[PDB]
Amino acid sequence: GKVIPKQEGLDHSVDFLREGYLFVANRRKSFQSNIFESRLLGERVICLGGEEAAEVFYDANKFTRQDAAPKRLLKTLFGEGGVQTLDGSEHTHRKQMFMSLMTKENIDRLLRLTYREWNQIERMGEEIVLYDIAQEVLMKAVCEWSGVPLAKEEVGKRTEEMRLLFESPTYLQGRKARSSAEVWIRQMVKEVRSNRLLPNEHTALYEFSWHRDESGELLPEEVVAVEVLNILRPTVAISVYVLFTVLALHQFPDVKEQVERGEVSKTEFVQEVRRFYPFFPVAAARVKTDFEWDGYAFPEGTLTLLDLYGTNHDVSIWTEPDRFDPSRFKDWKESPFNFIPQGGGDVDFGHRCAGEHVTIAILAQVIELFTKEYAYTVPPQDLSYSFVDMPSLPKSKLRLTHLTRN
């Protein structure tokens, strides 16, 4: 029989913009609570953080993603009708559609495509901006991987579009991008179902354009365009983690040397990059019907936020969360709720991120290239990144000089 700590005032949206990734964490410390209530986007909002609130937030008996995501993110970042917006058996079936791609062999294909693209950054020369090059590498690799025709002369435009999507006046700049992208891919989709274009099996455009939902029926063309965009867009967004991974290599020379000696694996270095650096701030959902957790009352329909970054730095879960220390993962298996940079819960039956294996494999290959394959200088520059602006980026965008093969 407890009261949920409540912030006074009519609107805290401005405060959420002011404090970004530190909003939930500042209030969890301030209140000394894993739960509190704010007002934003016109509504009462319940905020949560930590292992046990995470396990509750991913309890499908208690929470629903139906109408959870705000319509403006549907407009710019997520797409309408996507797997994000789905329920029960329908969601399980479509989520199995995404997971069919994440086989080891199909990811191997992707990683061969990224290696081949990366191999050409020796082309550009003695001075690269890593964020730009990463985006273009990833865009060409993931377009190829998904059977998506991407001509050379249009690589700037399409990669730019995906960037405005995952970085979403600028609001409707991102809106315009989403529209352009969606008709591009919708176009290609109808050329697939009418045999004017023939993408390979085990690619997203092929397997999605042909997908039969649980009725036995193909999906609408715009929905297919959305589901493809939910692979193209976040793969390019991996560029942010590329920046943070090379930054980690430069910022923590001792762990870099432990990576090169094999004391810590590449996977573990990647995990600690995803835990240490901010990227996705909160997941969202809605109380299904009135329930109680921990003596607290959740009213039906209440929008609810789970703190991903904050949970990843939770001092009750992690020893010295503020130290970059990949050895914290060796040998340590995470639960599905204590380490959640790309969502919590079970991937196949919950809304956890589809692309985690892809993310980790691409970042591990980056560690290999930027320690063993290439040599380079990091000149003095602004390598700081924001805790309040979303998403966070090292300011200089990682300017590398004197980049030569080892």
Annotated binding site: 58, 65, 91, 95, 353
Which listed residue (16, 166, 184, 339) binds ligand MYR by CB under 6 A? 166
Q: Give the strands of the sheet with 43-48, arranged side by side.
A: 35-40, 43-48, 303-307, 282-287, 63-64
CB of 237 to ligand MYR, least distance (A): 4
106 binds ligand HEM (CB under 6 A): no
CB of 48 to ligand HEM, least distance (A): 12
Closest to ligand HEM by CB, 255 vs 353, is: 353
Q: Residue 98 binds what, of ligand MYR, ligand HEM, none (CB under 5 to 8 Å, by partner type)?
A: ligand HEM
Backbone angles phi, psi at 33, to 5 degrees: -150, 145
CB of 204 to ligand HEM, least distance (A): 9
233 binds ligand MYR (CB under 6 A): yes
Indicate the SS3 state at residue 291. strand
Site string for ligand HEM, 159-198 (x = CB under 6 A): ----------------------------------------
Rounded Cα distance between 171 and 73, Å, is: 10
Are 236 and 293 in contact, with CB atoms under 8 Å apart? no
Q: How many CB atoms lie within 10 A of CB 176?
A: 12
Rounded to 5 degrees, what angle do the CA atoms 102, 226, 110 make?
A: 30
Write out the H or E segment, with its range, that includes residue 40. Answer: strand 35-40
Q: Which stretch binds ligand MYR (CB under 6 A): 92-100, 233-241, 324-332, 372-380?
A: 233-241
Q: How would DSSP label each residue in 353-405?
A: -S-HHHHHHHHHHHHHIIIIIEEEE--S------SSSSS---TT--EEEEEEE
Rounded Cα distance between 139 and 146, Å, is: 11
Nearest one of 141, 162, 343 to 237, comparing CA atoms: 162
Residues in region 39-58 near ligand HEM by CB under 6 A: none
370 binds ligand HEM (CB under 6 A): no
Site string for ligand HEM, 329-368 (x = CB under 6 A): ------------xxx-------xxxxx--xx---------
189 binds ligand MYR (CB under 6 A): no
Structure tokens at 352: 């956890």
Structure tokens at 254: 């001792």
282 binds ligand MYR (CB under 6 A): yes
Rounded Cα distance between 136 and 130, Å, is: 10
Q: Residue 233 binds what, of ligand MYR, ligand HEM, none (CB under 5 to 8 Å, by partner type)?
A: ligand MYR
Nearest one of 280, 255, 306 to 390, comparing CA atoms: 280
391 binds ligand MYR (CB under 6 A): yes
Residues in region 274-293 near ligand HEM by CB under 6 A: 279-280, 283
Rounded Cα distance between 19 and 388, Å, is: 5
Q: How many residues bind ligand HEM (CB under 6 A)?
A: 25
Residue nearest to ligand HEM (CB): 355
Which listed residue (237, 247, 347, 361) binds ligand MYR by CB under 6 A? 237
Backbone angles phi, psi at 123, to 5 degrees: -65, -35
Closest to ligand HEM by CB, 35 vs 305, is: 305
241 binds ligand MYR (CB under 6 A): no
Summarize as ranges the residues that interact with ligand HEM (CB under 6 A).
83-84, 95, 98, 230-231, 234-235, 237-238, 241, 279-280, 283, 308, 341-343, 351-355, 358-359
Summarize as ranges the residues that interact with ligand MYR (CB under 6 A).
73, 166, 233-234, 237, 280-282, 284, 390-391
